[PDB]
Amino acid sequence: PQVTLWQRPLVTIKIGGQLKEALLDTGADDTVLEEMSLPGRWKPKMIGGIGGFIKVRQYDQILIEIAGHKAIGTVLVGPTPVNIIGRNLLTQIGATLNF
Amino acid sequence: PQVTLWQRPLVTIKIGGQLKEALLDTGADDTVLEEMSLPGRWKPKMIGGIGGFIKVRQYDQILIEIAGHKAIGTVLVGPTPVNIIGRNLLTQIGATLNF
Ligand SMILES: COc1ccc(S(=O)(=O)N(CC(C)C)C[C@@H](O)[C@H](Cc2ccc(OC)c(Cl)c2)NC(=O)O[C@H]2CO[C@H]3OCC[C@H]32)cc1
Known part of the structure; x- marks a missing residue:
């Protein structure tokens, strides 16, 4: 779709067999989700944002369906x-910004 | 134009005659700029992201040119x-996210 920005660009995603809501975020290099159980092995990692840094679990090669589009990353x-x-996943679903 | 997401979607902006680089960010409700001296009244605000919150100064009705597209807010x-x-400014330049 063509997503306008008068509201937050929230979409439904499916991951690990669960439906969740997520924000399409062109200002993020990486995909970060709230605490949840995920299948594979994971590694401790750090990521930083506007407020500083947090500890995350890094899961590799995970399938996510984003508004009906498959990504694996x-x-x-x-x-x-x-x-x-x-x-990292917006590129997989072929997303671009245009104006 | 059509901005790719292989790299950070950085474009040139102009605010107060100053030329800067900025991220076109669908995940940001508001526009946040690196520390700079602006004249005029402002209002204290705190905004939150991945590391927690930071304190910012809120300036209203400021003119910003984004990749040659004028916006004010x-x-x-x-x-x-x-x-x-x-x-708040992406909407003013008619930006959409497409996939
Ligand atoms: C009320 O107005 C606002 C409120 C919050 C923000 S936010 O910057 O925290 N953020 C919100 C989001 C986390 C829910 C926008 C987001 O795009 C942010 C921008 C940014 C903030 C800080 C940055 O430098 C550390 C960069 Cl490069 C982008 N990106 C971000 O936190 O990304 C994380 C996940 O991927 C990595 O790549 C960039 C940072 C890491 C902006 C405006």
């Missing part, structure tokens, strides 16, 4: 204010 | 690593 899990879909 | 100024163009 790295998902970080930790204390984020909201689920955010970053460029 | 609220700008937040504080200790951010990067200049962030949020939805």
